[PDB]
Ligand binder design. Structure first.
Ligand code: CL
Ligand code: MG
Ligand code: MG
Ligand code: NA
Length: 326
DNA sequence: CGGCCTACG
DNA sequence: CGTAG
DNA sequence: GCCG
């Protein structure tokens, strides 16, 4: 009744198993901090299955036959059903390793490998990192300076104001170019921790060279607190009553021939896209990325004019963005 | 057992 | 190494 | 950690 890949089922943003999924996601996150990508994937997939169920799990019986529920994930759910807490989850939550790796990897410019090295060196707090700035890249310095603002979610209201400023710069850089909101906000989130925009132009080729022209214009408007092509990972100044705050914004350019693939990829969720690419390759023998869908036997790229085309190519029922919250 | 998404900066 | 979803 |  429940298919094995997340791209085969609808997953809404809000659901009926929030506490269970959150606990499994703690274990997934902790597996990532230890470099166990396989365990991370299993716990993420198990959490996602619960998000896709039509009602709450109330009894252990109800996990029988669900994909990605084995001894370990079932025990976690069992303990939550019986006691309201899972001892393993709570031990992770309180652990110095989990808490420090979570804090450090939240910094823009710091991944698991850097966080782990700092942890092994004995560093534990952001102020520890600030006291050794020669150990930091320019990107990490910006991430550390702006960390407090970047830790506070932005609202859809904020997103709409940002989009107008990006559109103004894009229109000067290339008249006729368009700006599409992607990421979690396109999946229906009312808040989120960064904003993603996808930029194209209806005449194939006209988008070449566009992103530098857009960045220069936003920089000259004083809106860019940090930037480093077709992807730009920025920190922008967002107005606030009587002041402003830093916000992470990603800007991506695609040619219109690739736009449906880029839209699909950048709309996420992350798990949904990994699952969709896995399904494409393993079940259909086709290779998917944010630029296209390749048949390696015929050595040809599928043309798509819409996300609907891509789901059809892959033999999957169409899911709107709001149902891609795997 | 092998596999676990696939890119760009 | 970082970033993205 | 789980699936095929
Ligand atoms: Cl693993
Ligand atoms: Mg996002
Ligand atoms: Mg983003
Ligand atoms: Na980070």
């Amino acid at each position: 009744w429940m298919p094995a890949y997340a791209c085969q089922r609808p997953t809404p943003l809000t659901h009926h198993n929030t506490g269970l999924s959150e606990a499994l996601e703690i274990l997934a996150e902790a597996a990532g901090f230890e470099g166990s990508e396989g365990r991370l994937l299993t716990f993420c997939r198990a959490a996602s299955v619960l998000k896709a169920l039509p009602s709450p799990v109330t009894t252990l019986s109800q996990l029988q036959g669900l994909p990605h529920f084995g001894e370990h994930s079932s025990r976690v759910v069992q303990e939550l059903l019986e006691h309201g807490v899972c001892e393993e989850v709570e031990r992770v939550r309180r652990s110095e390793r989990y808490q420090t790796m979570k804090l450090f990897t939240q910094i823009f410019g710091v991944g698991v490998k850097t966080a782990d090295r700092w942890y092994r060196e004995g560093l534990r707090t952001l102020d520890d990192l600030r006291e050794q700035p020669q150990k930091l890249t320019q990107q990490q310095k910006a991430g550390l300076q702006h960390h407090q603002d970047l830790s506070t979610p932005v609202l859809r209201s904020d997103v709409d104001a940002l989009q107008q400023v990006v559109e103004e710069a894009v229109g000067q850089a290339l008249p006729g170019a368009t700006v599409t909101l992607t990421g979690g906000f396109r999946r229906g989130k009312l808040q989120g921790h960064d904003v993603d925009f996808l930029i194209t132009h209806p005449k194939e080729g006209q988008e070449a060279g566009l992103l530098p022209r857009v960045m220069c214009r936003l920089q000259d408007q004083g809106l860019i607190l940090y930037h480093q092509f077709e992807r730009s990972f920025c920190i922008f100044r967002l107005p606030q009553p009587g002041s402003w705050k830093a916000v992470r914004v990603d800007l991506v350019v695609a040619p219109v021939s690739q736009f449906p693939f880029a839209l699909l990829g950048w709309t996420g969720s992350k798990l949904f896209q990994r699952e969709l690419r896995r399904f494409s390759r393993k079940e259909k023998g086709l290779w998917l990325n944010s630029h296209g869908l390749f048949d390696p036997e015929q050595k040809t790229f599928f043309q798509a004019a819409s996300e609907e085309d891509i789901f059809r190519h892959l033999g999957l029922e169409y899911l709107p963005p709001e149902q891609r919250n795997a």
